[PDB]
Design a protein around this ligand. Structure first.
Ligand SMILES: NC(=O)c1ccc[n+]([C@@H]2O[C@H](COP(=O)([O-])OP(=O)(O)OC[C@H]3O[C@@H](n4cnc5c(N)ncnc54)[C@H](O)[C@@H]3O)[C@@H](O)[C@H]2O)c1
Ligand SMILES: NC(=O)c1ccc[n+]([C@@H]2O[C@H](COP(=O)([O-])OP(=O)(O)OC[C@H]3O[C@@H](n4cnc5c(N)ncnc54)[C@H](O)[C@@H]3O)[C@@H](O)[C@H]2O)c1
Ligand SMILES: NC(=O)c1ccc[n+]([C@@H]2O[C@H](COP(=O)([O-])OP(=O)(O)OC[C@H]3O[C@@H](n4cnc5c(N)ncnc54)[C@H](O)[C@@H]3O)[C@@H](O)[C@H]2O)c1
Ligand SMILES: NC(=O)c1ccc[n+]([C@@H]2O[C@H](COP(=O)([O-])OP(=O)(O)OC[C@H]3O[C@@H](n4cnc5c(N)ncnc54)[C@H](O)[C@@H]3O)[C@@H](O)[C@H]2O)c1
Ligand SMILES: O=Cc1ccc(Oc2ccc(Cl)cc2Cl)c(O)c1
Ligand SMILES: O=Cc1ccc(Oc2ccc(Cl)cc2Cl)c(O)c1
Ligand SMILES: O=Cc1ccc(Oc2ccc(Cl)cc2Cl)c(O)c1
Ligand SMILES: O=Cc1ccc(Oc2ccc(Cl)cc2Cl)c(O)c1
Lengths: 287, 287, 287, 287
């Protein structure tokens, strides 16, 4: 029977979420996009305007099958959690049912139980400051949006998931080793994410027979990556120069691994940080 | 010349902070206690009442030399950050200059530049819930109080520290491996703490020639440990049964290591998680 | 089209080698078995008699496509390494082209370049002794047969492998955490093997565009697992009781991850220790 | 009172062994040098002539207290292991009681039980070759001399050591991350050695109440470091440029950590790889 995957964190076609959606489509997985409200209408415009048609090609006979595309904000757990300021926002005022709980309800109401969950989102409002100059509000924002949001996602989605479902998120090696430009408590958020992945694997594994893993991806010139002050170009030039595999890293490279982790093929893997980065993580120094 | 250590996180004599204060005293380090406001007066009462006199004995000729004891709340960065509710609290209303910045100023005003800093505090208001049932507010509290507080401590204290100063904090292996009762995002807070320790080592090391490390201690029946629902007794019974070293773990065991890390003897060590837990971390399973 | 895999280390159908063969067979990969001479003829007689006929049942009717079965000894790099006594041993006198180089040469002659390599073998004379009690000779035996053998397979098989080829081995968590009973220097060999996997990922990735990883498998009741003093019953019981995923771990659970890592889907993963143990490695203590 | 340390691996004053001896000497520990026979006599002639007289200067006048200097070869476990050719080699014919057991026996006879043990030696015939190019013999050479030797020292010295004694060795980060140039299987040996340190911490902690750890030292221009193909100049330059702590790493920086780990102050630490490299290990890439 059909499998359904909710992917939280799609803003365009240039990030890992799209890559994952693409590769799942090779396997005939029905895709639901969770899109952050501020960029939801523009995404919808581009999509309707056919801007993504070329990017939706799987191959000769296949074309990405997107079930639905919904507004999703990981800043908010339930309806009660939205503040008046966001309520009164140009971009949000015209949308509804976009809190993490509302989306689970809405999906379940529309299409029943799902069996695949992808957390592909991060945010840190002080990413451009180093850790030592990051404010408490800044740091807790990184953690709220980039780490707590995985926990909330699970808390609310497990009700609408079949036994033997699988969940993945995306991390970065800044958590384990210093990467000077990865500021604002983003390194910290990733660190908590990778540990939470373990603690969750235990809970979800024991209570629901549901698996959860995280992919530590190498650099990709995505929207958010360009936001960091360029960082991402140095990162890519460095990976391509010194990684064991001197080949350009594509989002569908992470996509194919995500697909495997999300399938019954990896029935015995849970609680892991899997490195999909051309082996760059294994190097001590430039050679 | 004299060395001064600020220890943040002393509530009684039964935790790691006291252990560290004791061992630093063997080396004639002047100790300043940072004490959380809610328990400051009771600590002061006990101290004046002589309740701690036996616990202050170093040995035949030495007696812990406590320079000062100040109210300290890691919840608050500066004066501006205190809310009206805490302002209007029985325990705080009668105290002042207890925010992280105020304490650095106050210490520096009183005794000049210090050269040793100890973060020995944690808190998580939902520690009794597992990760999956922890609320966003709960989780961010763990992180604010247990992890951001190290960053803030450094941001503000480096101004009042000599070159070649050293800083330590305390972590727990729950960050790296699942420990089912360590709830409320405490595992997450520790994970972020250990990663932050690295990122900070880079910044402080390069800019100020200041070192920072963290000690992953094994279980000790402390005030906060008894708070966890008992957990701590199982933990201790287990460590004593299966650790490589079948010997009771004492706070001064962590104390002696802290003393070494805080001294010039470990001039070449920074950014590390050091395990002071009778080797328990090396075991896969009960033997 | 025309994927060929050499699986080094199969004596019967109760191992992880068998499980890897079955899952690869499912993707229509051509299987070549490398078989240690002590057990080769009993394996062939068993095979011809159709004792494995039941074990080759894949799903609804599909049967294993074993392309060849070759005598193989990972002890010997080249014909010139073989000592006179082994050459004339009862079980070896009747066999040829069983050294690492010779099986490389052989495979190439009969089938051309292959693109998949599985190191699925370990040995140690003194596995029953704990590390402290292991002789220099028995430790070097363990390293030689269990660790050097991977380096040697690589040096020789890289010649007969197409660019973008993939290589896996199997490891155990005793290299990272203490597991009493895993003696003879087998933990040392797994440690070395997990570290050689990184060093090799570098050389092979840069010079040949070939990937190599290692699977850290959970416990399985194979022939060799029993030769360890029982140990394995305890291991399996511990695992089924305490793992996040309380299911029986099957050889085909490993096989499908092996399959994935050998395929182009894992193009961006190299140098890695991938855990396939139902998440047991993430646990600190039992509950 | 009456601490005795056997330091295995000193040829001159340019190593980490020298640095360990100097720092131990500062705490009034009695030093016994174990000296590889190829360099023993040139070391003695040098010593008697007072070539090391300058190097024994500690602080304001204090000089090293070398209690003994013994020929020692970690290749040989017992007299019966020594091959006829080595026995009659020019440099060995004039020496006795140089195997591991014999130096144990010897030390015990002349001084009684000791309480500190330093493994400060490595070797590999084919260090100049990369892993892929290393022969079976040269790999086993590396493991034998660099890794087995620690297990063997332990098995024999535990007999002549008091409860609560301590044991250190030296390792390098090439076991965990790829370092081209660190060939011959030296990375494999360090991997094995860091894993054997855990296994040994278990046995020795439980059966003898003895601790063992390992220091992962940063680069130092010792005799052996130069024998590696230059490699070390590059290593030191990289390290001084990119480490969190941009200071020159001295042998005595290692020595004072060794001292700490051998003393009772580290009573609760066992099984650990302690990094002494100015924090370089925490770095992902240069800046
Ligand atoms: N791009 C890289 O180099 C790289 C390397 C390692 C890991 N990652 C991880 O991969 C994931 C995907 O990011 P990306 O690199 O593809 O960039 P991206 O911009 O394509 O993805 C990030 C998405 O998160 C969404 N988002 C931001 N705040 C949100 C909120 N409050 N609620 C819901 N959604 C929100 C944004 O709309 C954006 O589309 C990220 O979590 C990132 O940490 C990326
Ligand atoms: N006790 C253990 O078993 C154990 C094991 C590993 C690590 N640790 C760590 O050691 C450290 C010391 O704790 P402990 O175990 O000695 O218990 P403890 O209760 O003695 O120490 C915790 C202290 O933190 C203080 N504190 C709480 N909230 C604060 C705030 N907002 N601002 C300032 N101070 C605050 C409390 O007053 C308390 O005295 C903790 O960080 C803990 O995580 C403890
Ligand atoms: N069985 C487990 O529970 C388990 C758990 C983790 C890892 N592993 C790993 O899996 C591998 C073994 O698989 P298994 O557990 O099914 O045991 P197994 O006995 O089924 O497989 C090992 C095979 O290797 C062959 N072999 C031994 N020495 C050889 C040599 N010198 N040259 C060629 N072949 C040789 C043997 O004939 C044997 O059939 C080992 O690397 C082991 O470390 C096994
Ligand atoms: N030098 C560095 O930069 C560095 C960095 C990390 C680790 N280490 C470790 O330190 C140790 C060596 O110290 P070093 O770097 O000062 O080199 P070194 O040459 O000064 O010390 C090694 C000594 O071991 C002795 N030795 C060699 N084979 C022996 C045997 N079979 N029996 C007894 N003794 C033997 C040699 O005589 C030599 O003096 C090694 O374990 C090495 O891995 C060194
Ligand atoms: O090159 C490494 C890299 C680049 C981008 C990443 O994603 C983000 C980074 C920061 C922020 Cl604020 C948001 C996101 Cl989605 C990331 O995790 C790692
Ligand atoms: O036995 C392990 C253990 C016990 C206590 C600990 O400290 C705390 C734990 C939770 C909270 Cl809310 C506060 C503190 Cl100080 C800890 O870190 C680990
Ligand atoms: O339970 C875990 C386990 C069981 C078996 C294993 O394989 C071997 C273990 C020792 C020897 Cl000599 C040979 C082999 Cl194939 C192993 O690696 C781990
Ligand atoms: O720069 C890092 C470095 C330098 C020297 C080292 O020691 C050796 C290295 C190889 C051999 Cl054969 C012997 C020894 Cl003592 C080492 O371990 C690491």
């Amino acid at each position: 029977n059909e499998d359904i995957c909710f992917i939280a964190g799609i803003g365009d076609t240039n990030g890992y979420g799209w890559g994952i959606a693409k590769e799942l489509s090779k396997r005939n997985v029905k895709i639901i996009f969770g899109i952050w409200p501020p960029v939801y209408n523009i995404f919808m415009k581009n999509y309707k305007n056919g801007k993504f048609d070329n990017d939706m090609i799987i191959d000769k006979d296949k074309k990405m099958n997107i079930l639905d595309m919904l507004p999703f904000d990981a800043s908010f757990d339930t309806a009660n959690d939205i503040d008046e300021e966001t309520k009164n926002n140009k971009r949000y005022n015209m949308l509804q049912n976009y809190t993490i709980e509302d989306v689970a309800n809405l999906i379940h109401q529309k299409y029943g139980k799902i069996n695949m969950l992808v957390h592909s989102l991060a945010n840190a409002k002080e990413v451009q400051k180093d850790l030592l100059n990051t404010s408490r509000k800044g740091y807790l924002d990184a953690l709220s949006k980039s780490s707590y949001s995985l926990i909330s996602l699970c808390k609310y989605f497990v009700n609408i998931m079949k036994p033997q479902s699988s969940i993945i998120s995306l991390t970065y090696h800044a958590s384990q080793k210093v990467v000077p430009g990865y500021g604002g408590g983003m390194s910290s958020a990733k660190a908590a994410l990778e540990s939470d992945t373990r603690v969750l694997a235990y809970h979800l594994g024991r209570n629901y027979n549901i698996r959860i893993n995280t992919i530590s991806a190498g650099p990709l010139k995505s929207r958010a990556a360009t936001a960091i002050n360029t960082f991402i170009d140095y990162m890519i030039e460095y990976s391509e120069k010194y990684a064991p595999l001197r080949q350009k890293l594509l989002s569908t490279d992470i996509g194919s691994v995500a697909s495997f982790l999300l399938s019954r093929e990896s029935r015995a893997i849970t609680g892991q940080t899997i490195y999909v980065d051309n082996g760059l993580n294994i190097m001590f120094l430039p050679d």
